[PDB]
Amino acid sequence: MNPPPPETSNPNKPKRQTNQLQYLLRVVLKTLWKHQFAWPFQQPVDAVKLNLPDYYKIIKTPMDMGTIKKRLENNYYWNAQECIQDFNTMFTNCYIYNKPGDDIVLMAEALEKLFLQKINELPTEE
Amino acid sequence: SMNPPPPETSNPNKPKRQTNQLQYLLRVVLKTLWKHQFAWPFQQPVDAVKLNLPDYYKIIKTPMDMGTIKKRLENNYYWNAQECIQDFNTMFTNCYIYNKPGDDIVLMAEALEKLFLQKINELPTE
Ligand SMILES: COc1nnc2ccc(N3CCC(c4ccc(OCCN5CCN(C)C(=O)[C@H]5C)cc4)CC3)nn12
């Protein structure tokens, strides 16, 4: 079976609105979401619908852009690095599960290149 | 390389008619396939530029996709149900030709084709 999706809102966690977190939602997540290769990464991997019975035997830290969008909206992250780690986990999971050079891996590699271009333009803390 | 222009979906010089088979192809066949979990790569012409497939249109000279078939049905472009069925078959076979047995995209096309064949076996009598 599929696991429940990652936690996205926690009222017990402290919250802060910052220019780096705003950039991650308004620029980074927005740009990646609209990319031509984003669709398979917009929601948690549905291992049942996709016939991947070993997906959650191999990937114990699933991550997807729909979860990242919700985390940003709900002030789940205190630091930009926590959000950046979730984007990195999403790409790494794809590289671990799939064979190198597969179409899905080339999609993730292109999204990662675009992500890293946008993270180089992360504004300095105000 | 550029993409070719998409297949024509409307031609005001062609005659038009409504048939129970053409209605069934839009209402039942195309609608059922469109909602399938693996339909999304087949819902628009193959954009070889955005998808980074430089040899696609060197191999596939009769491109076809469900977005085009849907528009053809909505524009009364088809006179015979056979023309619509041929377009679905062209779409699947193009996928089998460009890709290789066992590729994820081919398994997606095979699942759609199985459903298509089930729905076409119940095509109403003219
Ligand atoms: C008619 O289209 C058409 N004709 N020739 C072609 C040639 C390639 C091609 N495409 C490019 C590849 C794409 C695609 C491939 C696999 C895939 O998922 C595999 C399962 N995933 C699920 C999601 N995550 C994040 C994963 O790590 C693993 C577990 C998803 C999309 C479908 C479109 N389309 N194409």
Swiss-Prot record, chain B:
The record marks 99 as: Acetylated histone binding. Phosphorylation by CK2 disrupt the intramolecular binding between the bromo domain 2 and the NPS region and promotes binding between the NPS and the BID regions, leading to activate the protein and promote binding to acetylated histones. In absence of phosphorylation, BRD4 does not localize to p53/TP53 target gene promoters, phosphorylation promoting recruitment to p53/TP53 target promoters. Residues 17-123 form the Bromo domain. It is found in: Nucleus; Chromosome. There is a cross-link at residue 58 (Glycyl lysine isopeptide (Lys-Gly) (interchain with G-Cter in SUMO2)). Ubiquitously expressed. The NET domain mediates interaction with a number of chromatin proteins involved in transcription regulation (NSD3, JMJD6, CHD4, GLTSCR1 and ATAD5). The C-terminal (CTD) region mediates interaction and recruitment of CDK9 and CCNT1 subunits of the P-TEFb complex. It is also required for maintenance of higher-order chromatin structure. It is linked to Cornelia de Lange syndrome 6: A form of Cornelia de Lange syndrome, a clinically heterogeneous developmental disorder associated with malformations affecting multiple systems. It is characterized by facial dysmorphisms, abnormal hands and feet, growth delay, cognitive retardation, hirsutism, gastroesophageal dysfunction and cardiac, ophthalmologic and genitourinary anomalies. CDLS6 inheritance is autosomal dominant. Chromatin reader protein that recognizes and binds acetylated histones and plays a key role in transmission of epigenetic memory across cell divisions and transcription regulation. Remains associated with acetylated chromatin throughout the entire cell cycle and provides epigenetic memory for postmitotic G1 gene transcription by preserving acetylated chromatin status and maintaining high-order chromatin structure. During interphase, plays a key role in regulating the transcription of signal-inducible genes by associating with the P-TEFb complex and recruiting it to promoters. Interacts with p53/TP53; the interaction is direct. Interacts (via CTD region) with CDK9 and CCNT1, acting as an associated component of P-TEFb complex. Interacts with RELA (when acetylated at 'Lys-310'). Interacts (via NET domain) with NSD3, CHD4, BICRA and ATAD5. The interaction with BICRA bridges BRD4 to the GBAF complex. Interacts (via NET domain) with JMJD6 (via JmjC and N-terminal domains); the interaction is stronger in presence of ssRNA and recruits JMJD6 on distal enhancers. Interacts with NSD3. Interacts with NIPBL. Belongs to the BET family. JQ1, a thieno-triazolo-1,4-diazepine derivative, and I-BET, a benzodiazepine derivative, have been tested on tumors with success. Treatment with GSK1210151A (I-BET151, a I-BET derivative) has strong effets on mixed lineage leukemia and promotes myeloid differentiation and leukemia stem-cell depletion. This is Bromodomain-containing protein 4. It comes from Homo sapiens. The lineage of its organism: Eukaryota, Metazoa, Chordata, Craniata, Vertebrata.
